[PDB]
Amino acid sequence: KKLTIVFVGSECTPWSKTGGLGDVMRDLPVNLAQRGHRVMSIQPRYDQYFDAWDTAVRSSIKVNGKLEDVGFFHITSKGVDRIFIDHPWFLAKVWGITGNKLYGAKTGVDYPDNPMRFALMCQAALEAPLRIPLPDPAGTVYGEDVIFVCNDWHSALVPIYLKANYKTRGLYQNAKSIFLLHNIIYQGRFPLEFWPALNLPEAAKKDLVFESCFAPPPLDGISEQPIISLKPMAMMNFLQAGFIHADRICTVSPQFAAEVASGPRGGVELDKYIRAKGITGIMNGMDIEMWDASKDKFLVTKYTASSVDEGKAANKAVLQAEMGLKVSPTTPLIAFVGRLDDQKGADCMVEAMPYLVNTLGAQVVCYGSGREDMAAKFKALEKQFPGMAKGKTAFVPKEEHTLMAGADYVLMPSRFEPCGLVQLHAMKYGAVPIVSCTGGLKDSVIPECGFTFEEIPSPEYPGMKISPELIAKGTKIIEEGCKEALAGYGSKAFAGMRAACMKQDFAWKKRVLVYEKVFYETLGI
Template identity: 45%
Template sequence: IEVKVGDSIEIVRFFHCYKRGVDRVFVDHPMFLEKVWGKTGSKIYGPKAGQDYLDNELRFSLLCQAALEAPRVLNLNCSKYFSGPYGEDVLFIANDWHTALIPCYLKSMYQSRGIYLNAKVAFCIHNIAYQGRFTFSDFPLLNLPDEFRGSFDFIDGHEKPVKGRKINWMKAGILESDRVVTVSPYYAQELVSAVDKGVELDNVLRKTTITGIVNGMDTQEWNPATDKYTDVKYDITTVMDAKPLLKEALQAAVGLPVDRKIPLIGFIGRLEEQKGSDILVAAIHKFIGLDVQIVVLGTGKKKFEQEIEQLEVLYPNKAKGVA
């Protein structure tokens, strides 16, 4: 398909597979591919944590337009007897700021022409700390009518990317979507409780209705009785027998002394303040002198990664970090 990105017309391709009852569609364009040499997982949004690629607005504008076209042009509605496009009666789930243009393009490019009239957008906030704030002069790059400027308009006290007036993608996603949801009822309450909790969007969220939905779990993939990644399988009747064996396997795998009696603490999460990583690092120094071991699994801000590495040096038989 062809989409307009900034001042140019770009050709977009799709890859599609059908797995476990779900159509999975991937957007193919050089703007994505040439950015991610090396360790892909940490280079999708920028060359390093906390830094955007200079063309991120164009990249995610392309992604949003491609997402809106896919249900109309791809043969996704797969079954034994029929294969064709989903059509226009679609609910779009937009996740975080990168997809915040979906409700805007839906209204300006489609519904204004009588297309997708029944389509709706639910905007899901996973992490409000990342909002897609860019210089206000970039608004024309999005190819949106002037009536949307107010939804993007944002002023804060930070100097990045520029000081003063900006556009804020997440703000627009919140205001232009039909519903706003987030990852838990508690997080929904937290986001509207204070300026710092909502990262300056608390007042915008209070103007809407935000619904917290607890994260779901694939009970087949995470079934300990059939988990292909564990050497010892268990269920509710055998968990206490399996636990010490799996503990010993973990200790051996990360290079800690194998001892089923010593308390073993585990942390899994992104290494950033929002996840309490600063508190974790400070706390480890307080209790590591006890008869205890700790394993930290995660990546994130460089300073926390370096502090975890330093813990390994200081306490080689007690602390291990796994990226």
């Protein structure tokens, strides 16, 4: 068939990234482009990207009543014409290359521009197909028979800007809008007085207005404690307006799709739109070219599934040495990777450390970046457990590859996981996953590949008065869950899990065909 597709989000690897979001908006659009579709990605210009060149095409977008000049920077990479929205609110943010902290200064603290920024980002994204000729400035323009894939709350306003501004005036009529939920807790909930600044018609105010007792913290600077009233408050919600006007909802896992429809816990407070409209779970793939331990760049000894035992223990020595753990091939090696906050479950895992080293015997590597509390405790691991544990906060792409090939077991104690990528990455490289039993972790870590202890407790949640000194005995589920899995290290069962893990196929080729048909339905052909 072949059609025009336009991805719209707040991250694209390698340019911006705080986690999986960026990686999906790198991989998915390329693997769609391989099928013959004309694909584009649209992201903000947070920093002066050396490979991003000004198209010279400007436009003016109305925000907070004042017109705003924005520019459009372009780059063709892997058949995907990516575009970057240039403006002072994105580019001139707090310094040190941004990288992480795209959306806030600290972690838990957001920038008060975010309403206007992602209001600006969306409207601007709707211009790009109309007024920028690609690949070269003497080439064709994208046009109007274009499907928009929009990713999380940050691009949750393009369905409603599309209909309320553009389709009104007789363009993008053939165009449809797909929403893609990577996460449910992040909904773009803002105070109601930011309404004027959005520049949507007054009819469309009804779709943004929203009532709940849980609001994210006051958007000032220092506070990060979600206020909780008895009578529900009035506020905004970009994500609901994404659900209202999206011509289809997708999400990143069959199991997670189920958990969002399930009710106000699993849908945060938005369950009744998803359950009404429907949500197709398409689990995330991975890049096979990049993640391939038979042919990997960052590996000393490269190995297949036929030659695992040798290859891993070789790359484990490298790892043990690099972290500075005793170089013992018979000592188990558990690896944790994920952001340092409540969702990924560091706080409990770290409380569970003595039992993992002192009682089970294993070594524990710990990558992560996020809140100041858990970052502090991570660095001091190698002090308190000398040569039996390390905590790396701040790290490189290269450092995550050696960690997988070296680790015996990989650990994810998540409260919930829409899909997760570190367990997919591990299984590719033979590291046997010990996981929390939620979402994409349930779908991906089958019993043939790994272990699945029961999930970790949260509150009524989106980080309320977080982890009650009591509920933080979630720890014991990890102590227990690991004890089973590691008792069995060096079994023929373990060698079967190793082989099983790597024979699984995580390439997008399959996933894309599902994504591709969901388009055809929403359109017509």
